[PDB]
């Protein structure tokens, strides 16, 4: 009979039941989106968008709803921390419902098309065989994608008729959903310019409309029809898989690097913000400024928002996780409660010292304090017997400015050491480790999981492209090579051109 | 709620083992005729 791995090939010459299978897959996906969103609503804590935002709680689909404008719940909260909101029907709950209902409708349509599989529409009037005019279908479907793509850009994103999209400042502090005007200039191609996203969909939409017009009206050339087996639906699978893995690699890329469509308030920060001290620089700008207008140290550090301090913390770096460290980030380091404040270390001579920060590559890292110039001046030693830079010897202290500990200073070495061990991770926070029985080990964020999954699926789908590409072009020998094939064909010199019997001698 | 952890595995198997038994016997019944 059919091998287990060929079961679904009974659909290849059965357009109706192909549609039925495609409907059922569609229903499954929609059902999943619906189900996933209900699970996230049941587990999300909305009470703190500063220190407990969605991307700390393992939320995967909640950020895609937020991205395009869904921001509030029928229970009266929004993700921007505003209470007493009325979102109407298109809350997180109503989006989830609409996907369940949709799933159920598609389930039903799949049953009808499975049973009434023999519709005359699918039978070539000429020969009576099941036939699908794939060139013409592509024109139709392309025209339709063009229109959706144009309309999505022209109305949803611009806000002419719709909500816009998530936009924020460069440091992820003030994000919200805002209409976006298209950027027609060359800065439209800057992945960090959201106006480029609007422009893209308008211009590409139109181009898709016109390309689809061409593909409805003008037949493919015989040369291209033969070369690409355009009467065989497996050719479309082969080229469709190719475009999917291309698409999946780009979306893994923009998720890992940052684009205007992968904002840090919805997905968390990138690893490259930690590498480049992107948040630490900005924090230091604001402090230096404050001290330039006569504020005290306590005042200038007290003026840094917790949200910005929290970005400058390696526990939020997506490249700090592990593959089987499962669940939300809050199950690792715990639920962030408060900024403890900026820790300033000084040795016995008053000179201020700086903990060397943990690079992402390192599961563990030693505690080394340097001076403004990078000279090592203090460290926690391993071998104690010949140690010359110990906190005890060098008399280092820690004083806190801002946050929970503003104005406090510690001088006992064991306590200075524990704050120095945390300073390797950046700014120091108070964590609730009890609620979730957190184990203290870093996990990755939704930016991490997304990228991993899509990179992996993209790579696997390349194999699918090679597999279906070959089966299209070699279909004649799928079951095997021709039994009555001779050495004059495959041996050397008999023919001047390989394969061409007409080139004798 | 503070609920018996093994309840889940118990329920899944309680469902899965007898159901798979029935399916096995049905499908090989249809392959006969």
């Amino acid at each position: 009979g059919l091998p287990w791995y060929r079961v679904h090939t009974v659909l290849i010459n059965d357009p109706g039941r192909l549609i039925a299978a495609h409907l059922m897959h569609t229903a499954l996906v929609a059902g999943w989106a619906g189900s996933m969103a209900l699970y996230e609503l049941a587990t999300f804590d909305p009470s703190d968008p500063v220190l407990n935002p969605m991307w700390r709680q393992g939320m995967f689909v909640l950020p895609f709803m937020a991205r395009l404008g869904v921001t509030g719940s029928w229970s009266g909260w929004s993700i921007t921390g505003e209470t007493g909101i009325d979102p109407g029907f298109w809350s997180f709950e109503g989006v989830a419902l609409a996907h369940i209902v949709l799933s159920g409708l598609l389930f039903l349509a799949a049953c009808w098309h499975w049973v009434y599989w023999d519709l005359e529409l699918f039978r070539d009037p000429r020969t009576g065989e099941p036939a699908l005019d794939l060139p013409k279908m592509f024109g139709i479907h392309l025209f339709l994608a063009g229109l959706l793509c144009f309309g999505f850009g022209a109305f949803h994103l611009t806000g002419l008729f719709g909500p816009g999209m998530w936009v924020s400042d460069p440091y992820g502090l003030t994000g919200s959903v805002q209409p976006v005007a298209p950027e027609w200039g060359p800065d439209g191609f800057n992945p960090y310019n959201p106006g480029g996203v609007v422009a893209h969909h308008i211009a590409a939409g139109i181009v898709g409309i016109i390309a689809g017009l061409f593909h409805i009206l003008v037949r493919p050339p015989q040369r291209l029809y033969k070369a690409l087996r355009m009467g065989n639906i497996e050719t479309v699978l082969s080229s469709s898989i190719a475009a999917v893995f291309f698409a999946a690699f780009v979306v893994a890329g923009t998720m890992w690097y940052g684009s205007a469509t992968t904002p840090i308030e919805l997905f968390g920060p990138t690893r490259y913000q930690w590498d480049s001290s992107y948040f630490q620089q900005e924090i230091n700008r604001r402090v230096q400024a404050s001290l330039a207008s006569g504020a005290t140290l306590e005042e200038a550090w007290s003026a840094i928002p917790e949200k910005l301090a929290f970005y400058d913390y390696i526990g939020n770096n997506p490249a700090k996780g592990g593959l089987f460290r499962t669940g939300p980030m809050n199950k690792g380091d715990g639920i962030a409660q408060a900024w403890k404040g900026h820790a300033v270390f000084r040795n016995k001579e008053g000179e201020e010292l700086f903990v060397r920060r943990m690079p992402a590559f390192f599961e563990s890292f030693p505690v080394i304090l340097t001076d403004k110039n990078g000279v090592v001046k203090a460290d926690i030693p391993f071998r104690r017997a010949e140690s010359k830079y110990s906190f005890e010897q060098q008399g280092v202290t820690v004083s806190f400015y801002g946050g929970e500990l503003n104005g406090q200073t510690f001088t006992d070495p064991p306590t200075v050491k524990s704050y120095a061990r945390k300073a390797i991770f950046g700014e120091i926070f108070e964590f609730d480790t009890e609620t979730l029985n957190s184990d203290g080990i870093f996990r990755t964020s939704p930016r991490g999981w997304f990228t991993f999954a899509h990179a992996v699926f993209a790579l696997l789908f390349f194999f699918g492209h090679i597999w279906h590409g070959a089966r299209t072009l070699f279909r004649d020998v799928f079951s095997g090579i021709d039994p009555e094939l001779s050495p004059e064909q495959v041996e050397w010199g008999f023919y001047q051109k390989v394969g061409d019997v007409t080139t004798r001698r | 709620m503070e609920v018996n952890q093994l309840g889940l595995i118990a329920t899944a198997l309680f469902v899965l083992v007898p159901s798979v038994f029935l399916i096995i016997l049905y499908v090989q019944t249809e392959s006969q005729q």
Binding site: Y39, A42 | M1, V3, G7, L8, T11, A12, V15
Partner: peptide
Amino acid sequence: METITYVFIFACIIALFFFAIFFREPPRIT
């Protein structure tokens, strides 16, 4: 988890209903 389990089983029963009605062995006479 217990909520998901309860609703899951209930959902299976409803699906079974569907097949039992519309995909039954059709009774045939004599």
